[PDB]
Structures are given as structure tokens and as C-alpha cells.
Design a protein around this ligand. Structure first.
Ligand SMILES: Nc1nc2c(ncn2[C@@H]2O[C@H](COP(=O)(O)OP(=O)(O)CP(=O)(O)O)[C@@H](O)[C@H]2O)c(=O)[nH]1
Length: 121
RNA sequence: GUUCAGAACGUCGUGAGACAGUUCGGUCUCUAUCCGCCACGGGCGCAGGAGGCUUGAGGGGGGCUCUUCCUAGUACGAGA
């Protein structure tokens, strides 16, 4: 994106089990994409469709934004945040201490849990 | 089916013959009367003569099951 040196960042939205770790970065980001009747449907992000059995997303790869800032940094920051629940963390940890910071909304129902403490460690 | 003659082995029986030992083909009788019943009645009553309507103790009857897909995939459940 021509965005030479400077800018960019590292943020991730990690949380406990079943928390819609694929809600925030779903769409309608103004960036314009995923449509034509073939929208990324519920739980986009490639995946494999096979997970349709229960939308049990394995990992979160790719999915980067571009423009959306009221005339600012434009777009400089990752967007990878594998979901799950202590089922791939360790193995997928490779992405844990990869991008600084990690977003994630607490479940209004179950709420915070273990995955929260361990996820912070 | 075995529980009658056949014959059959097998086998006991000195044999005649037999065996809850099996096997193989071995005649099944049916014009209703009372009660009983499904109706269908014929009489008479039910008490000014009729005709049409009906309400109904009383009996019946059938008196069903499940999947799917609901809300919401939420309470809880660490997920499942
Ligand atoms: N009623 C309701 N449903 C929500 C809410 N947020 C997310 N969801 C629903 O719950 C589903 C799961 O949320 P989401 O975290 O994005 O998916 P996931 O839990 O990460 C499944 P995986 O971990 O495999 O990616 C979503 O399909 C979405 O429809 C909410 O605030 N209210």
C-alpha cells in the first residue's frame, strides 16, 4: 500500500471459548469487499467451509484492512487472531507472542474465564 | 403334531413284537330351538284423537403417536 517505513502495528482479539472471535473483523469495515450475493456469510475468513458443521474455526490467517481512517494512517496493522479454546493455543501459540496487543470482547453471558488469565500470561 | 393300520432304519427284545427314538405320505361331522347377540320387527300401552317436531337421565364412540423445524442454540455446562 505504498505505506513505507513507519506506521503499522500489531493487535489481536483473543478471548475465551465461544466469544465471537470472528465478529469484529467480519465485514462492513467500509473497506468495501465480500459481496455479490456470495458474501463471506457468517464466520468468513476462508476457513474451509467444512467447519460449517459448527463454525468451529481452526485458526485466523490473512484478512488485512486498507483504508478506513478519517485521513490518517490509512491502514497499518495486522489482523490475525486464531480462535478456539485451549485447543490450539499452545500449538498455535506461534501467533501468540507474534503481534503486540490483543483485542477481545468479554461474553455478556459466561463472561471472563480461564482462557482470559492464561491468554494474558 | 404325535397318540391308529404302511413301511423304514435304529435298537432292545432268544422272537412274537415292541421304544417319551426319530422319521415318511394318515378320512376332521355339522340344515338352529331357548337364553346370547346384530338388526329388523309385529302387538299394546304411554290413558280430549290425532300429525310433526324435537330435550335426553341412559349406552356407545373415539378416545393416537412421533419426527421435523421454532425461540435459541440461549441457563447451566471450561468445550463437547
Ligand atoms: N445473540 C448473539 N449472538 C452473537 C453475538 N456475538 C456473536 N454471536 C453469535 O455467536 C456465533 C459465534 O461467535 P464468534 O465468536 O464470532 O464465533 P466463534 O465463537 O469464534 C466460533 P470459532 O471459535 O470456531 O471461531 C456467531 O456465529 C454469532 O452469530 C451476540 O452478541 N449476540
Amino acid at each position: 500500500v505504498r505505506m513505507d517505513l513507519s506506521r503499522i502495528r500489531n493487535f489481536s482479539i483473543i478471548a475465551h471459548v465461544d466469544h465471537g472471535k470472528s465478529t469484529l473483523a467480519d465485514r462492513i469495515l467500509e473497506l468495501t469487499h465480500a459481496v455479490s450475493d456470495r458474501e463471506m456469510r457468517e464466520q468468513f475468513l476462508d476457513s474451509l467451509e467444512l467447519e460449517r458443521e459448527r463454525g468451529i474455526t481452526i485458526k485466523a490467517s490473512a484478512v488485512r484492512v486498507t483504508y478506513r481512517a478519517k485521513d490518517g494512517e490509512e491502514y497499518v496493522f495486522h489482523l490475525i487472531d486464531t480462535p478456539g479454546h485451549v485447543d490450539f493455543t499452545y500449538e498455535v501459540s506461534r501467533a501468540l507472542a507474534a503481534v503486540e496487543g490483543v483485542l477481545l470482547v468479554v461474553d455478556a453471558s459466561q463472561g471472563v474465564e480461564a482462557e482470559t488469565l492464561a491468554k494474558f500470561y
